[PDB]
Design a protein around this ligand. Sequence first.
Ligand SMILES: Nc1ncnc2c1ncn2[C@@H]1O[C@H](COP(=O)(O)OP(=O)(O)O)[C@@H](O)[C@H]1O
Ligand SMILES: Nc1ncnc2c1ncn2[C@@H]1O[C@H](COP(=O)(O)OP(=O)(O)O)[C@@H](O)[C@H]1O
Ligand SMILES: Nc1ccn([C@H]2C[C@H](O)[C@@H](CO)O2)c(=O)n1
Ligand SMILES: Nc1ccn([C@H]2C[C@H](O)[C@@H](CO)O2)c(=O)n1
Lengths: 240, 224
Amino acid sequence: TRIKKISIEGNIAAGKSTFVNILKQLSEDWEVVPEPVARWSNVQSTQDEFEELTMSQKNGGNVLQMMYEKPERWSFTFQTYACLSRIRAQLASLNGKLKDAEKPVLFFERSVYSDRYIFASNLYESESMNETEWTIYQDWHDWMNNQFSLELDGIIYLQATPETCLHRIYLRGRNEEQGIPLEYLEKLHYKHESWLLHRTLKTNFDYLQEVPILTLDVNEDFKDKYESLVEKVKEFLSTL
Amino acid sequence: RIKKISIEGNIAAGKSTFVNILKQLSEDWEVVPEPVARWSNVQSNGGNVLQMMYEKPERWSFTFQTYACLSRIRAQLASLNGKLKDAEKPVLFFERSVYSDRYIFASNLYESESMNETEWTIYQDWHDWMNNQFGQSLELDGIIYLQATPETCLHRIYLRGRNEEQGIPLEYLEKLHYKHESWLLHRTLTNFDYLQEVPILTLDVNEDFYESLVEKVKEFLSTL
Ligand SMILES: Nc1ncnc2c1ncn2[C@@H]1O[C@H](COP(=O)(O)OP(=O)(O)O)[C@@H](O)[C@H]1O
Ligand SMILES: Nc1ncnc2c1ncn2[C@@H]1O[C@H](COP(=O)(O)OP(=O)(O)O)[C@@H](O)[C@H]1O
Ligand SMILES: Nc1ccn([C@H]2C[C@H](O)[C@@H](CO)O2)c(=O)n1
Ligand SMILES: Nc1ccn([C@H]2C[C@H](O)[C@@H](CO)O2)c(=O)n1
């Protein structure tokens, strides 16, 4: 497509949703694909066209919480569903949004690359996924990718300390995340740094080595840096 | 333009045997085996996820079922992509389909509580999506149902000698048989509404191996 695809990346509660959903109003050609975290805390599949007329769409289980409560049991299930639901959402907005925009930009809250190379990879490294699960996951992810359009034109990395992220998890108050310890955020932090700052992390996706990356420090209170962040963003986009 | 035909039936009914015979009747006829080897040796020597599922179905059934279907979709798409399409009347025989994966096997595991509600819902959502994207391409023109009794199937499991399967009880095979009968014989069993229209040839394969069965296929296909 003519739509530029830009992923917003960063640790848990770095402020990606906040930033990008405020950022996107600056232009009517700018849209966001949220991460489907609602679909994870309330697991639902489609109703039959007649049954939905008389039966409600009930609340399902919370696979996000199942993963946090027992990662060695539920990591693989969670990570597969996370990626699937993301791909669904990103593909539909690609094929559906920003038609007849002049300079259309679609910002993705996280990417299939961070699902694999940050979150899933970290679970494998922590023995929360075994060899078989990790092989199946990567096999499936490779296949999904070679099938599917989503190639990124750029990455905006929102960098915050593990401590900042831990505080913001508390501020946000998602119930399933309230037992996350500092060490877990630290491990995710180092993965992001390797991928997006030091660029030493190797992926199956050659183009990524070349994709332009904008790194923005988001540790400060929202007002204190937003103007410079916005100006850095428009400057970056002008380069793509 | 490739006609797509799925061969269905219970564990060790004789589907791989039958389709491998069929294949030889024409250069225009190809087969997509169930990727069983890929499940026995997980790779991109790996784990045996078929074995893990049979040994600990409450732990591994969702993982197994997801990979089973993923690997089938992959193999089936691959075969349409190259294997014939320069043939007079090309036919592709699938050893099982995404519909048996979901509505027979995964469904039976949910029923027996080897998957919980969350796993079953994730599985169905994944399958719905994965199909809306492809499926149209993998849509069946006909089904051949190989019907054999659960006892015949249990005997043939023993004859074939797959280690992971040797402990399967008759009762599990009875459950699978009832789902197949419901789907393909009684037609009481899906949210793929085109399937209600797909012709089904039922073949009784309970007897030791068959001439006539193969001819019945050659002619059933001329009606598609
Ligand atoms: N710069 C900031 N200053 C103060 N709070 C922030 C800032 N960025 C995000 N927040 C807050 O931190 C929490 C997590 O932000 P959120 O956008 O939900 O993170 P993410 O989408 O990266 O997980 C929210 O409660 C939000 O109000
Ligand atoms: N009609 C038959 N008579 C005797 N043995 C059969 C017959 N059909 C299959 N077999 C044997 O039974 C076993 C199961 O057959 P196979 O084709 O592997 O089953 P499937 O592909 O349905 O699981 C094999 O060892 C095969 O040689
Ligand atoms: N592949 C992903 C994506 C997200 N998350 C988690 C981190 C947050 O708790 C929540 C939403 O980003 O889901 C995860 O564990 N794995
Ligand atoms: N969706 C599927 C497909 C196949 N099988 C099993 C039954 C046999 O034991 C083996 C190969 O057919 O895999 C399964 O449990 N579920």
